[PDB]
From Swiss-Prot, chains A, B:
All late proteins expressed from the major late promoter are produced by alternative splicing and alternative polyadenylation of the same gene giving rise to non-overlapping ORFs. A leader sequence is present in the N-terminus of all these mRNAs and is recognized by the viral shutoff protein to provide expression although conventional translation via ribosome scanning from the cap has been shut off in the host cell. Homotrimer. Interacts with the capsid vertex protein; this interaction binds the peripentonal hexons to the neighboring penton base. Interacts with the hexon-linking protein; this interaction tethers the hexons surrounding the penton to those situated in the central plate of the facet. Interacts with the hexon-interlacing protein; this interaction lashes the hexons together. Interacts with host dyneins DYNC1LI1 and DYNC1I2; this interaction might be involved in intracellular microtubule-dependent transport of incoming viral capsid. Belongs to the adenoviridae hexon protein family. Induction: Expressed in the late phase of the viral replicative cycle. It comes from the Viruses. Major capsid protein that self-associates to form 240 hexon trimers, each in the shape of a hexagon, building most of the pseudo T=25 capsid. Assembled into trimeric units with the help of the chaperone shutoff protein. Transported by pre-protein VI to the nucleus where it associates with other structural proteins to form an empty capsid. Might be involved, through its interaction with host dyneins, in the intracellular microtubule-dependent transport of incoming viral capsid to the nucleus. This is Hexon protein. It is found in: Virion; Host nucleus.
Length: 51, 51
């Protein structure tokens, strides 16, 4: 371990959650979760878009 | 006009149809006609891919 200070996992002090670009969820390796054209990008959840 | 030859418009003689690359249909200016996740590229009718 060799680390004092805040432990986010059992302390609730999260800070790296802004470093997520996108996430894709697939069921049965065939069907995307946010299907049915629900989202603006219907294939997967975008979090940050830089272009 | 200044052209005597096989005229594609009313002769039925087409040869430039291989020069297309992609088609993007968009009904109501908000939704692509293929719409639901149907093609490998869901939003566009790619005809020729190079990269």
């Amino acid at each position: 371990f060799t680390y004092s200070g805040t432990i986010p996992y059992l302390d609730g002090t999260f800070y790296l959650s802004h470093t997520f670009r996108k996430v894709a969820i697939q069921f049965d390796s065939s069907v995307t979760w946010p299907g049915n054209d629900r989202l603006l990008t219907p294939n997967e959840f975008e979090i940050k878009i830089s272009v």
